[PDB]
Design a protein around this ligand. Structure first.
Ligand SMILES: Nc1ncnc2c1ncn2[C@@H]1O[C@H](COP(=O)(O)OP(=O)(O)O)[C@@H](O)[C@H]1O
Ligand SMILES: [Mg+2]
Ligand SMILES: [Mg+2]
Ligand SMILES: [Mg+2]
Length: 581
């Protein structure tokens, strides 16, 4: 950032005012800027139409909108408020795309089961009326003082209702509604959030939404500057029209405040009156705060006093760190780096973290499955392998992405897109690890043919000099007819695949997984072959699984199949048990 202020001072050709100073401290900070990932990201194969969340076409009529955000720092400080707020925000990003939130998917990484994080998530999720269809729980002391909370949200939006995260023409107005702005971020509540969801969609139907963006880091500042910058336009932000929680706030406060449950809507001036009516009706606070213009300047006004004015683009774009070319080495073999294997059934139940109460199949089997209609549905998988990543960064990440495809295929789904969250340590002290990650993901996608639809990033995850295990959490989207999805029943258990790994024959395993899934077999793809959750959920059906699991370690290419007949495929197949009663 030091580098960054003399750059700012260079561009501004003067010392920044107190406000500018504040305004850039946020827009240019890693979180909002992505100065270390912009380049590495642009490299990744994209798809759909990403705004505040990637939107993937699911059947030419409907599209699923999803994204996976992190809440690592705010969760480290406060677990409950940390988690719940992460849930609040990511859901808004999905909301801002015109899709109705339909699932919340977990990805916790901790030194122990922090009840604060699990409840903050469950509570908020329940209070907005959005199920937590699935999740992923990784336990390790390596995450002792740096809990990783990766929350993924998803929703459905008709393709003829997709909402853009940008301003299109000089003359539109930007509306800010939802919670009232107050000195937050120099405590969110789902009731409001719920009204925001029910209120936003409402407006969307009436064609009253021509552009939108959630309010997160940066408050009124980020949402307006980015709404106009994305469309090479400008804005005349009138801070006195922002509804305030605490009325005695200074311009710079209102502007940069980070109050929760707030949205920004870009629309036609003639539509605002209605936006504010649907907004007030749902007990929210709205008003026409900003106005999009042609001169690419970001002019912030209070009443008649000029608070600030800068080249909108200078704000939108942050200095870009260079990139480092990582050249994959030979694949090394990993050793049992273990993640404690902790059982939190009755904990998830105590806090109502039901995880899968309305899916085609209990998310305890990995890939969640949601219906869109009788014969139309999508799949959600969240994977990650820091145990391998720790050891080797490139190959451990590449593998998490491959293992995700399996999970996706073990439910009968076609992989469509990937959303990922980058949980890394310090990029400056060790910029190679980061590149080893991004490259691993760049390659894995080019290998599987699955494109990145959206993503997130959390860097500088360190505890007094120590960086967290390189952790890229993979969020894959699958397509799938629910009717064809396989449900568990009494059958024999098989071990299909190799106890080891080989990048080439990954696709042969994908091939076998498909042949079998389609023949109606029920498959399981987890690095441990079988776990607590699996066993337990089989009981849900009144099934007792009895198998003699071979030994993989610690990155194999084998799944478990449960069918009547023996699997006839062009890959190792060995019978190993039952599943009855
Ligand atoms: N790791 C990533 N993979 C793919 N896209 C990413 C990644 N990190 C950031 N992005 C994209 O960069 C853009 C800005 O990200 P972000 O600031 O998180 O937007 P938002 O405030 O809506 O979360 C978005 O398109 C986001 O999806
Ligand atoms: Mg942003
Ligand atoms: Mg956003
Ligand atoms: Mg966001």
């Amino acid at each position: 950032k030091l580098r960054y202020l003399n750059i700012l001072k260079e561009k501004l050709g003067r010392e920044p005012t107190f406000v500018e100073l504040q305004a850039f401290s946020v827009m240019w900070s890693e979180h909002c800027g992505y100065s270390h990932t912009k380049k590495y990201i642009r490299r990744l194969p994209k798809t759909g139409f990403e705004g505040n969340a990637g939107v993937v076409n699911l059947d030419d009529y409907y599209s699923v909108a999803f994204k996976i955000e992190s809440a690592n720092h705010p969760s480290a400080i406060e677990p409950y408020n940390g988690a719940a707020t992460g849930v609040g925000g990511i859901i808004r990003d999905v909301l801002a795309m015109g899709a109705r939130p339909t699932a919340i998917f977990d990805s916790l990484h901790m030194s122990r089961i922090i009840d604060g994080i699990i409840e903050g998530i469950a509570d908020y999720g329940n209070s907005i009326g959005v199920p937590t269809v699935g999740g992923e729980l990784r336990i390790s002391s390596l995450y002792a003082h740096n809990p990783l909370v990766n929350v993924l949200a998803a929703g459905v939006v008709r393709n003829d209702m997709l909402v853009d995260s940008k301003a299109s023409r000089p003359g539109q107005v930007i509306v800010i509604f939802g919670g009232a702005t107050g000195r937050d971020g120099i405590v969110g509540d789902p009731f409001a959030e719920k009204m925001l969801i029910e209120a936003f969609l409402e407006m969307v139907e009436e064609g009253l939404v021509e552009g939108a963006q959630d309010l997160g880091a940066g408050g009124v500042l980020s949402a307006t500057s980015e709404l106009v910058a994305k469309g090479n336009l400008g804005a005349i932000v009138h801070l006195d029209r922002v509804p305030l929680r605490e009325p005695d706030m200074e311009p710079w406060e209102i502007l940069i405040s980070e109050s929760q449950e707030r949205m920004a809507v870009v629309t036609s001036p003639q539509k605002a009156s209605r936006i504010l009516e649907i907004a007030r009706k749902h007990l929210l606070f709205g008003d026409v705060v900003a106005e999009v213009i042609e001169e690419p300047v970001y002019r912030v006004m209070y009443r008649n006093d000029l608070v600030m004015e800068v080249p909108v683009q200078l704000l939108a774009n942050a200095p870009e760190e260079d990139i480092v070319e990582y050249t994959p080495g030979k694949i090394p073999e990993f050793k049992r780096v273990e993640f404690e294997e902790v059982n939190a059934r009755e904990v998830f139940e105590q806090y109502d973290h039901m995880v899968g109460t309305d899916t085609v199949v209990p998310p305890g089997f990995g890939a969640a499955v949601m219906r869109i209609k009788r014969d139309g549905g999508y799949s959600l998988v969240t994977h990650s392998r820091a145990d391998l990543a720790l050891q080797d960064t490139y190959w451990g990440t590449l593998i998490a992405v491959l293992e995700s495809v399996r999970k996706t295929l073990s439910v009968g789904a076609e992989p469509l897109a990937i959303t990922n969250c980058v949980n890394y340590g310090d990029p400056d002290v060790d910029p190679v690890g980061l590149s080893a990650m991004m490259t691993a993901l760049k390659n894995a996608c080019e290998f599987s043919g699955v494109p990145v639809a959206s993503g997130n990033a959390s860097l500088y995850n360190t505890y007094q000099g120590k960086p967290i295990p390189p952790t890229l959490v993979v969020g894959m989207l699958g397509k799938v007819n629910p009717q064809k999805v396989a449900k568990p029943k009494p059958s024999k258990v098989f071990a299909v695949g190799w106890n080891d790994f080989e990048l080439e024959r990954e696709k042969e395993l994908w091939r076998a997984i498909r042949k079998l899934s389609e023949e109606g077999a029920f498959i399981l793809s987890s690095s441990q072959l079988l776990t607590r959750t699996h066993v337990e959920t089989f009981r849900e059906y009144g099934l007792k699984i009895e198998v003699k699991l071979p030994e993989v370690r610690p990155a194999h290419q084998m799944v478990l199949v449960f069918s009547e007949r023996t699997p006839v495929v062009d890959v190792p197949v060995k019978e190993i048990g039952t599943l009855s009663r």
